[model samples]
Target: MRVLLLGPPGAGKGTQAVKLAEKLGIPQISTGELFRRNIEEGTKLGVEAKRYLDAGDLVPSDLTNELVDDRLNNPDAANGFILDGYPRSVEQAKALHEMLERRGTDIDAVLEFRVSEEVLLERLKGRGRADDTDDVILNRMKVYRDETAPLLEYYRDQLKTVDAVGTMDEVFARALRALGK
Candidate 1:
């Protein structure tokens, strides 16, 4: 199924995306990975993205949309794919809609992993990533609330909230149920 995975930092979107993709026989596409792959392959878009990165600037939404559009054109994506870490704003969401509309398809569902701030704080600390300091995690949450929360409204009808405070299996099962898989 074509799906978009959404969550705040430490909300387990990565874990669920990998499992869901495997179960559905679809590739899991993350924007960060997309950027890295394009740059590594030295494609035209990649070169331009690299220039922006070298200058410490955010890659324009148009460029990001082009990269996503290119990736979605792959043969394997003919059936479907799981999108993660993308459409970070309303503009990006609109771009994605336009791209999908041109292809005569749309997102089947949006899986939102819901976790309380307390749980997220504990989980983030437990992971101990080098960059996930308290201040950093708090800032990331703020950004998510400001920039990404609105996406819930944008996809409200197709959105399903998965309880993210449980065990991995529990969360995965809930997601599958939500997706009716």
Candidate 2:
């Protein structure tokens, strides 16, 4: 199944994607990993992405979309894959749809983790990463909700909201059961 994971950071989507992809026998395409792989290999897009990264600027969404589009053509993803926290905006989601449709495919399931704002604040703030300052955390929270409104509307029919309220195994089982696997 081509599953798309929608969730905030620290909501266990990354861990859940890893397990789901392993069970489903498909790659877990994390966009951050894609950026790293491209940058490490110095591909054409990687070179451009590197320039922006060096300047401490976010890579443009279209550039990100193209990277994902390229990754989808890989042999490992031929059967299926799980997307980890991508399509942060409606435009990017549409771009993904276009590319998938071009290949006569599309997302089979959309899983949105239902996490409380209080829990989110604590988790995001407690991570202690260099970028986990108050400003950045709040901004990312703001941006995620802002960009997500339309995306939820667009994928509402396919969405399965999962409550990420337990341990990794507990949450993983819930996610799998929700997908009827």
Candidate 3:
């Protein structure tokens, strides 16, 4: 139901996003999935995004915003949608509002999964991925704190903090309760 899910690394956002979208009978508009899909399909946006990705640089906000804009216009999103992992900064958040306003829609809620640093570290380290090293996870947490925390303030009362430490079902249930579903 027009939701934006937010969380730190290892907060199970992607997993819950899929579940919530399915339960709500709405598409899960994931930025990561959109990027991969565009790149795989070789769309014009994908081509431009690939240039930055190949250079090992962050894709510019405008390019990402364009991709998301195209995505939001899809017919499936006409009813409602769940946005996963996006608007990483206050600027992007403002852009999202403007974009949605243009479409005559807005997010119903911003669900923030709350987890402690120790829990996040443990969860990430357990993944055993080459990129999930302690240093990298710590750096990611630092980035989230410095960059993404402001979104909590920006969204303010619209933000719902869900405890993210528990079984998958438990967490999902907590998220639903928070969303007042």
Candidate 4:
């Protein structure tokens, strides 16, 4: 049940990951939540991460890798876990692969909720986050394509792409079927 949920922001990743992980008895690990948690708790790593966060910059890959690696090794992840919206670049994916290899582990699949540009734009408009803007959203897609597209080929045999342009149940069903659960 080791899974990775991949998609641009606002693609229902969090929603579906929660349901699928719950039903499948796996933990859904959200990197976004992890970022907030670290910052909120003001731990050593949080202080280091907050500098970049307050600057509106993406955290460095090493810091992200460290946090996730720690989380993934916990008891809850021993049986299985779902990685939601992580490994945002090929480098990160490679880091994950190497880290997992060291632990003699591997992911079962990478699930991508594919949405067309038009649909994605519509979805972004409804998200009232301060960072949600036409230009920002499009730019983020550019970043995703530039960085994440290669990881698809990197993990092609384990990659699953599902149409995200549908109702919650429809998308959830598609993901579940892809995950073969």
Candidate 5:
């Protein structure tokens, strides 16, 4: 199944994506990881992405769309794949929809993980990453809403809300069940 995992930073979407990818035997394509790896390796695209990120600006949708498009062209993604935290803007979503349409396929599911802000603050704190501060978390929350509100409507018919407040295994099961797997 071609699936998309949508949620704020602390909602454990990445964790669920990993498990779902493994369980379904499909690749997990994460734009966040793509940017990180590129930035770490300092590729041309990495340098460009870093410039915007370091400036405290969101990377442009065209750049992000190119990365996702490249990944979707991988041979293993022919049948299916799991995408995490992508189509992050309305433009990104439109690009993705058109690109997949050209390939005569499309995203089959959009699983949105739901969690309380109180829980997110606690879970985010447990990560101990330098960027996982309250200020950043709140900012990310705002950004997520701004971007996702539109994307939600775009995928309204396919969206499935998965409660993500429990343990990892519990959430994983809930996700699988949501997809009827």
Candidate 6:
């Protein structure tokens, strides 16, 4: 029942992650939330992560991996969890694969939510986050597509590209169909 929701920023991945997790009775793991939690708790990983945020530099992949590892080991995640927003690149994907393998588990499916640039821009406008501006959002999507392309192949046929356009229900329907529900 483990699922990984992938999409460009504003493609509703976060929204869908929560909904799907609730529907299936699984924890929804979001990297953004994880980072914030770590920082607020002042864990060692959080201190390093905070330094990167304050300096406007990306948190190194090693630290990101450590944080994710910690999260996956939590009691609530023992059964399974929905991953959203980690493994942003192939390197991270590899890290995740290795980490999961060591724990005798793996992702059930990597559900990639696809949406056109126009739709993404429109949706991001509603988010109103400081990083959700038109220019920054587009750049992030481009980065997502570019980095994700290689990682998609690594997942073999486990990669499921779900159209992210249309209503929430419609998109989730498409996902359920992909899962053969």
Best by TM-score: 5
Compute the lDDT for candidate 5: 0.70
Between candidates 5 and 6, name the one with more favorable TM-score: 5
Per-residue lDDT of model 1, residues 88-155, tens digit only = 55654676777776756655787777776666666654665676355654544554565555676777
Worst 10 residues of 2 by lDDT: 50-59
Show where candidate 1 strays beyond 4 Å.
36-58, 127-150
Task: Estimate the TM-score of every prediction.
Answer: 0.73, 0.75, 0.75, 0.76, 0.79, 0.74
Clashes of each: 0, 0, 0, 0, 0, 0
Tens-digit lDDT track of model 4 for 76-156: 677587888666667546767776668666567778878655555556555646663555546556556666557767766
Candidate 6, residue 142: lDDT: 55
RMSD of each: 4.2, 3.9, 3.8, 3.5, 3.1, 3.8
> In model 6, which runs have C-alpha deviations exceeding 4 angstroms?
39-44, 47-58, 73-76, 123-148
TM-score: model 6 vs. ground truth:
0.74
Residue pairs that clash (backbone atoms under 3 angstroms), model 6:
none
Candidate 1 vs candidate 3: the TM-score winner is: 3
For each candidate, the alpha-carbon lDDT, in order, equals: 0.68, 0.68, 0.68, 0.68, 0.70, 0.67
Tell me the lDDT of candidate 2: 0.68
lDDT of residue 48 for candidate 3: 59
Q: Which stretches of model 5 miss by more than 4 angstroms? A: 47-58, 127-148
What's model 1's lDDT at 35? 71
With candidate 3 superimposed using the best TM-score fit, by how many Å does residue 119's alpha carbon deviate from the native? Answer: 5.0
- In the range 118-177, model 2's lDDT, one tens digit per residue, is 554555555635653565556555556656667767777667878886466787778877
lDDT of 3 by residue, 95-164 (tens): 6777776757755788887876666556654664665356644544554665555776677656777887
Model 2 alpha-carbon drift over 4 Å, by segment: 37-62, 117-127, 130-132
What lDDT would candidate 6 get against the real structure?
0.67
